[PDB]
């Protein structure tokens, strides 16, 4: 019974993978980029199945030119004892062989076997280092990404740095985008993983991300640079970038991604004084995962040092687990600035004695120093009158008749014009 | 069937500060027990208080005797006879509502009522269960079942008769209540239905009008609400019937905040004992404060805190504290000065508000279209 | 039926007096208007607050100094009224386009 | 023109909602488009002309 369903699923996966391979060949046919992302778009869904019989049948069907590269997977591959070329001996397209080796790697990967996957990924990159075809650049991006996924669980990311650097430079010379985006994201993860934040930041400043890169890679790069500038103290640009990335983040999947992004945007916001919205603490896929950070935010909004200390002592393992323990140190030291922020938003003017009373500062001079530091940054706009003691805020002039709407509208209309122009350029009429 | 919430909201679930754990409420519940004998209200009682008293089994004896007698009657008339459709089997189900629902649990009666729903065809039985397990989901806190019943009643059942689902907003009156559901549609159908009650099973008309007032003033502050709740006829008659809530409404309408605050405290206190209480009583009593404050700030440019206290009840210092925690929420647009003691209102004019709303709705649409243009054309 | 009716008439005639006067003025002290209208400060203050709150008389009260201000709201806002509603109209258009993308 | 754009956009939304339940088988879209074009030219010309009038027709 189970064998029958397994055979039917093997046949349907064989046909789907055959569709993928034919898609590679009619993508290499027509000499055009694209229609290969149509090939690689659903490798997660097909990699969901990845049975042994279908892989062996695909190997025996599309590697009819039996080479040593096919004879290296066979030792580790477990071929069925009892068990299709869609047919002559035409030499295999390098894109096709790279893709087939990719699925072989991914099957060998999902089965918790890492070392042989490490070697096989290494031999996949040693041959991909020889090809100079754009048809093997979009495929090569995903080969690189799944290769680094193979390597990640083997805890050997440092050795890959030289290879990723070399291939990123190769992509930049050839003006690659998908390979460039994947390599840049992966190498930023490499730098941050070994806590080389200075190195990653310096690399970021001299590297320009391609605007044509796919949405998910753009979101990854935005996340990486946002983390870099958040631990680099560029909080405003940090929150802007993570909000952008969450707008670009997938709605359904990437639960871990959205969880980490939510955690770091929460800490960045309350470091800047902004309070995260409660609704993001309510979705089931995020509720219990942010429950430590939810208690964090509860203590931050309450601001009591006792509950703050108990929350820290109870969740410090979670705080460092995301590389935010120093971040939460600065959080614990910026809650006072946050408090001053709502104090000044509520009050147009307030005596520093009243500041110390509402904030428990125990001194008017301490309140003066703290409020001066806070107003140094762009947290509060005011005009301190020490003649009498005023913290008189700037007159809230009419936003209209102030040229600010004109600038915002100019930026927005430029955005719409670029969107329209890119859309009209992307009409892409066919030949026949 | 089970009207007075079985007191379970106030009996031993409203203990501590309101202290209602043993009182005349216990006697009322045990009166609704000795007639229509119950061990279902004893579920939390077997754990907390009134667990294993002598009466629990000294009444168990003839409660079980009577209930086997009645279910045996239902059986013998269901098996010896072959009554079809709306039949003695339905009598078994409704008895088992007065019984096993009000003997031991709902679940078996859920099985029975679902089976008879598959058996019976007409809408009266399914609406009977709608309100049965609606009130059950008030007792045992079920909501997915209730909303399933409401969707069935409206979308597909409500192609013959009508007029009955309206008072079933009680569940929406307490579904999302702390958010939107204590009001809006929870008022517009109460306001739609207040003229024609016709649902004395669920609650008395007086309590219905009190609930209608409570949801109406939170739904509508002064968006010409006077045309619907103040100038309304039946509402005015029952407010003549209930002076307290009448004062509570008219004080807000007539800007008598000094007495409106006392009325708000009174309604909050009597409000802590309802199906309404647990979810949103904090939310209601904060939101009404917001509404009254913002009502005064409107038609006002800058106010001395002394007149703030004097004309809006009391509490110069209390008004700074409350108004501060409320502006910090972003609502009630006004900027306040210290010992100069000026409260400058900074509500944007319709033009600047329109510009801000443009920025917001634009940015949302631009985000959506940017995502679309990015997924499309790669 | 004559106490309520005459109370309503008294309120209405108070309103008519307060609009028929103050037309010459744009910024007049509440003391001046009360002495010209013969009410207490608190009662006339409450009446003016009620009048503006009912949007019967456009203005705003600066009790921080104790003055009534007068202005008008320009109706050019109709273009923005159209603009925002058209914005969410195109938003629903974009949602339908999103569904058409799901087709692809 | 913005009111006409309102009504044309409502018609566009309704037509596009029909489009999904429509395999290949006055469009609100075109009329919308020339309304957009006329608003474009009129408004941009008015803004630019007013600004040049600010510059060249100057007291100095």
């Amino acid at each position: 019974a189970a064998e029958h369903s397994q055979r039917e699923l093997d046949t349907v996966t064989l046909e789907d993978i055959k569709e993928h391979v034919k898609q590679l060949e009619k993508a290499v046919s027509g000499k055009e980029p694209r229609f290969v992302l149509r090939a690689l778009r659903m490798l997660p869904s097909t990699s969901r199945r990845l049975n042994h019989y279908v892989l062996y049948k695909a190997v025996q069907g599309f590697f009819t030119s039996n080479n040593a590269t096919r004879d290296f997977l066979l030792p580790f591959l477990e071929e069925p004892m009892d068990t299709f070329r869609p047919a002559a001996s035409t030499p295999l397209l390098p894109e096709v062989e790279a893709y087939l080796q990719l699925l072989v790697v991914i099957f060998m990967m999902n089965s918790k076997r890492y070392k042989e996957a490490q070697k096989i990924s290494d031999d996949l990159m040693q041959k991909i280092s020889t090809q100079n075809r754009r048809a093997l650049d979009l495929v090569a991006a995903k080969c690189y990404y799944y290769h680094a996924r193979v390597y990640e669980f083997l805890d050997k990311l440092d050795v890959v740095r030289s290879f990723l650097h070399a291939r990123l430079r190769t992509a930049t010379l050839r003006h690659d985008a998908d390979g460039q985006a994947t390599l840049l994201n992966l190498l930023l993860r490499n730098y941050l993983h070994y806590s080389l934040y200075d190195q990653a930041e310096k690399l970021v400043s001299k590297s320009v991300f391609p605007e044509q890169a796919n949405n998910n890679e753009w979101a990854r790069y935005l996340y990486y640079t946002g983390r870099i500038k958040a631990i680099q103290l560029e909080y405003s640009e940090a929150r802007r970038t993570m909000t952008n990335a969450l707008r670009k983040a997938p709605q359904h999947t990437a639960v871990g991604f959205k969880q980490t992004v939510h955690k770091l945007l929460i800490v960045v916001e309350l470091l800047l004084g902004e309070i995260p919205d409660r609704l993001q603490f309510r979705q089931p896929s995020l509720k219990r995962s942010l429950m430590p950070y939810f208690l964090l935010t509860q203590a931050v909004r309450t601001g009591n040092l006792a509950k703050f200390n108990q929350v820290l002592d109870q969740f410090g393992e979670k705080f460092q687990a995301d590389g935010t323990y120093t971040l939460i140190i600065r959080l614990r030291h910026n809650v006072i600035k946050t408090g001053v922020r709502m104090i000044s938003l509520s009050y147009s003017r307030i005596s520093l004695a009243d500041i110390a009373q509402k904030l428990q500062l125990d001194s008017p001079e301490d309140a003066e120093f703290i409020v001066a530091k806070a107003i140094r940054d762009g947290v509060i706009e005011a005009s301190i009158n020490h003649e009498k003691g005023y913290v008189q805020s700037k007159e809230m002039i009419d936003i209209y008749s102030t040229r600010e709407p004109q600038l915002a509208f100019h930026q927005r209309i430029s955005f719409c014009l670029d969107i329209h122009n890119m859309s009209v350029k992307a009409m892409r009429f066919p030949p026949k | 069937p089970k009207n007075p919430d079985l007191r379970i909201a106030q009996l031993r679930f409203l203990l501590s500060l309101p202290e209602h754990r043993g009182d005349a409420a216990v006697r009322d519940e045990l009166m609704a027990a000795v007639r229509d004998n119950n061990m279902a209200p004893y579920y939390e009682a077997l754990c907390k208080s009134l667990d294993w008293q002598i009466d629990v089994d000294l009444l168990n004896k003839m409660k079980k005797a009577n209930e086997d007698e009645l279910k045996r009657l239902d059986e013998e008339l269901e098996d010896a006879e072959k009554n079809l459709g709306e039949s003695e089997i339905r009598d078994a189900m409704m008895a088992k509502a007065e019984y096993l629902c009000r003997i031991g649990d709902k679940e078996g009666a859920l099985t029975a009522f679902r089976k008879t729903y598959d058996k019976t065809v007409a809408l009266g039985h399914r609406l009977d269960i709608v309100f049965y397990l609606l009130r059950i989901g008030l007792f045992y806190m079920d909501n997915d079942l209730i909303t399933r019943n409401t969707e069935k009643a409206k979308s597909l059942i409500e192609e013959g008769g009508d007029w009955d689902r309206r008072n079933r907003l009680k569940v929406y009156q307490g579904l999302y209540c702390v958010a939107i559901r204590d009001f809006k549609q929870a008022a517009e159908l109460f306001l739609d239905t207040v003229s024609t009650f016709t649902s004395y099973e669920l609650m008395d008309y007086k309590t219905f009008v009190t609930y209608t007032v409570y949801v109406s003033m939170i739904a509508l502050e002064r968006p010409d609400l006077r045309e619907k709740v103040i100038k309304g006829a039946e509402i005015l008659e029952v407010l003549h019937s209930l002076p307290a809530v009448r004062q509570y409404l008219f004080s807000l309408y007539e800007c008598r905040y000094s007495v409106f605050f006392q009325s708000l405290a009174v309604v909050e206190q009597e409000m802590k004992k309802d199906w309404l209480f647990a979810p949103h009583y904090r939310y209601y009593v904060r939101e009404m404060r917001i509404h009254a404050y913002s009502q005064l700030l409107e038609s006002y440019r800058s106010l001395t805190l002394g007149y703030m206290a004097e004309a809006f009840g009391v509490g110069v210092e209390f008004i700074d504290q409350e108004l501060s925690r409320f502006i910090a929420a972003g609502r009630l647009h006004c900027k306040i000065d210290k010992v100069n003691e000026i409260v400058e209102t900074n509500r944007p004019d319709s033009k600047n508000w329109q510009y801000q709303e443009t920025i917001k709705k634009g940015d949302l649409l631009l985000n959506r279209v940017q995502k679309l243009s990015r997924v499309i054309n790669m | 039926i004559i106490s309520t009716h005459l109370a309503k008439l008294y309120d209405n005639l108070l309103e008519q007096n307060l609009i028929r006067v103050i037309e010459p003025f744009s910024r007049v002290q509440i003391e001046h208007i009360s002495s010209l209208i013969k009410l207490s400060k608190a009662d006339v203050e409450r009446k003016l607050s009620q009048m503006i709150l009912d949007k019967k008389f456009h203005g705003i009260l600066d009790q921080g100094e104790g003055v009534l201000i007068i202005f008008d709201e320009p109706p050019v806002d109709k273009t923005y009224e159209a603009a925002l509603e058209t914005i969410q109209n195109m938003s629903k258009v974009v949602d339908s386009l999103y569904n058409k993308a799901k087709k692809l | 023109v913005v009111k006409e754009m309102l009504e044309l956009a409502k018609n566009y939304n309704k037509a596009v909602e029909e489009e999904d339940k429509m395999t290949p088988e006055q469009d609100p879209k075109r009329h919308l488009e020339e309304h957009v074009d006329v608003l474009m030219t009129s408004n941009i010309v008015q803004c630019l002309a007013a600004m040049l009038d600010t510059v060249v027709f100057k007291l100095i």
């Binding site: 034919k22 009619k26 509208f409 927005r412 209309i413 719409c416 014009l417 969107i419 329209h420 859309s423 009209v424 992307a426 009409m427 892409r428 009429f429 066919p430 026949k432 | 443009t358 634009g362 649409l365 631009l366 279209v369 679309l372 243009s373 499309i376 054309n377 | 603009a83 058209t86 914005i87 195109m90 258009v93 974009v94 386009l97 058409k100 993308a101 087709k103 692809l104 | 913005v2 754009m5 956009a9 596009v16 290949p24 879209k29 919308l32 488009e33 309304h35 957009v36 074009d37 608003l39 474009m40 408004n43």
Partner: peptide
């Protein structure tokens, strides 16, 4: 906002229709 965003949405709508039309033409042709 009005005409420019409307034009952008219209252009995107014209885009996706072609992308379906091209996809449908390809499917009619494997």
């Amino acid at each position: 906002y009005l005409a420019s965003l409307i034009r952008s949405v219209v252009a995107l709508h014209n885009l996706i229709n072609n992308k379906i039309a091209n996809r449908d033409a390809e499917k009619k042709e494997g």
